[PDB]
């Protein structure tokens, strides 16, 4: 009834608590099945943590865990690919409440299946069952698409950038709460007890959407689910209509969004593996401060975005955001000490003002009745970006480990030169 922000807050809390606990269970079960009584992390680096020798069994269990995360994530991604683009275009024809209630129920169901597997110590393949069951009903991707479409359907043309930044800042606040309230909960009797908050958060989101949420689709029509006019409505969004030079901009902004969120997703994960690296060797509290400072960039940018719009357009704000991300990811790449590592975190205080800008510039190119289809496409792109970021950056970091640590961060900074060029070119050519 206030808005759809609490829905995304609870769903993001559920997802950000689910990821580390699920991979921790994968570590526990896969190690136990092979008689490996050892630490559940990857191999350490420097500061005497080891003797330099490699562990054939720990590396094998780590590879197994990475492969099983890949398997469950790809299964979820494919079923979400085929479900989000069916439930979004439908959502813009029947309303946003059903498509924000179904995925929350699916998330609660996968949380229940995960709890059943963790408590019964069942095979890790039944995690894939919960992932597919949630993915069919639309997953956290569909919560994202429905929330962004609801914000796009309840705001002006000028207010979309700020009202999307507000919701994305709520997304990141939920991420911070997950990171530093399941970070210090997963350590203390963790891995099962913190998982009850995933089910609790998903149930709370389902109840809030079903009861306390206010529908924003003004003239709700009568549409049939399972029609094939929902898969056609994302194709006749990118290729057929909007021929008046606003069809190239959809592809270019989708490309910029892909690269930008790929860089963000990869660089968050390498952050703790780097912080507790060889010349840093951060303790448990320093990396907690690091995670917090990484997840305060969200709100500091919901502030810098709103402040900078008083003098600039809504695109140069994103250009400034991409220079803050590049200065941070180049500084962090060259950080061999804690003042230089935390300066990089501080420099990225406007890093997250470019994703909401791209989302809004996409949402202002489509009709008011296609904000479901557009953000279904965007959610699918953000899932693919998560997968690609994981693969690329977890392949770069081990390889460029004895040559230059932080090269993954510098490569992410280099990749951010393409969204900046794309967005600057798009604005300059149109305004000329």
């Amino acid at each position, epitope marked *: 009834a206030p808005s759809v922000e609490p829905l995304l807050f609870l769903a993001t809390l559920a997802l950000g608590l689910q990821v580390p606990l699920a991979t921790q269970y994968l570590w526990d079960r896969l190690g136990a099945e092979r008689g490996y009584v050892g630490p559940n992390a990857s191999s350490p680096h420097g500061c005497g*943590n080891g003797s330099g020798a490699v562990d054939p069994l720990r590396e094998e269990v780590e590879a197994l865990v990475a492969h099983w995360n890949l398997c469950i994530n790809l299964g979820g991604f494919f079923v979400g690919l085929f479900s989000v683009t069916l439930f979004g275009p439908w959502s813009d024809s029947v309303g946003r409440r059903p498509v924000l209630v179904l995925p929350a129920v699916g998330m609660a169901v996968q949380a229940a299946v995960y709890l059943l597997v963790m408590y019964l110590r069942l095979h890790v393949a039944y995690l894939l069952l919960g992932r597919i069951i949630s993915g069919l009903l639309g997953d956290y991707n569909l919560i994202l698409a429905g929330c962004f479409a609801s914000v796009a359907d309840s705001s002006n043309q000028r207010t979309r950038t700020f009202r999307v930044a507000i919701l994305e800042a709520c997304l990141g606040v939920a991420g911070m709460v997950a990171s530093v309230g399941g970070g210090q909960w997963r350590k203390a009797e963790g891995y099962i007890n913190p998982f009850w908050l995933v089910l609790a958060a998903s149930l709370a989101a389902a109840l809030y959407a079903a009861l306390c949420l206010q529908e924003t689709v003004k003239q709700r029509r009568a549409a049939k689910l399972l029609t094939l006019q929902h898969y056609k409505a994302v194709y006749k969004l990118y290729t057929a209509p909007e021929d008046l030079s606003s069809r190239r901009k959809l592809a270019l902004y989708s490309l910029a969004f892909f690269l930008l969120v790929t860089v963000h997703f990869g660089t968050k994960d390498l952050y703790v593996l780097y912080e*507790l690296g060889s010349p840093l060797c951060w303790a448990s509290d320093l990396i907690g401060y690091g995670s917090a400072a990484s997840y305060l960039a969200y709100l500091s940018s919901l502030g810098g975005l709103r402040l900078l719009q008083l003098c600039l357009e809504d695109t140069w704000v994103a250009e400034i955001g991409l220079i803050s991300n590049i200065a941070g990811l180049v500084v962090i790449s060259l950080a061999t000490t804690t003042p230089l590592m935390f300066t990089g975190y501080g420099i990225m205080f406007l890093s997250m003002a470019a994703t909401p800008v791209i989302r809004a510039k996409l949402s202002k190119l489509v009709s008011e009745t296609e904000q479901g289809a557009l953000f279904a496409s965007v959610a699918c792109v953000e899932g693919l970006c998560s997968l690609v970021a994981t693969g690329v950056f977890n392949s770069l970091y081990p390889s460029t480990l004895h040559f230059m640590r932080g090269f993954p961060f510098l490569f992410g900074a280099i990749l951010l030169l393409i969204p900046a060029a794309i967005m600057g070119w798009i604005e300059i050519q149109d305004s000329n």
Partner: nanobody
Amino acid sequence: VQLVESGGGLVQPGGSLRLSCAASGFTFSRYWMYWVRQAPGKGPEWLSHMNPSGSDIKYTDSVKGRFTISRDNAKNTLYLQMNSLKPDDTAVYYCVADRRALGSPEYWGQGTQVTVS
């Protein structure tokens, strides 16, 4: 933070070395405790682990019912007693201290040198 082990040394086969590991620099009552031996010309051979209480005690097959991990949160000295020592047990026994979390560091020890012969 340092975990210092001292129970090693030359013991004839059929020995009863009691390894100790005194942790100074953290709580030691919130950390899981392991035991690893890097045998000469090999890699780590993780031997045991124990939760901050003593409820989750896990071994490998080459030490099951033969090595007996133990910790004293009061004394802050993790132990490990070794029965039926064989010249296959010659190694450098380390003493790591994880948190059984994916965003927490490992604190290896210096490593004693058991030379069963």
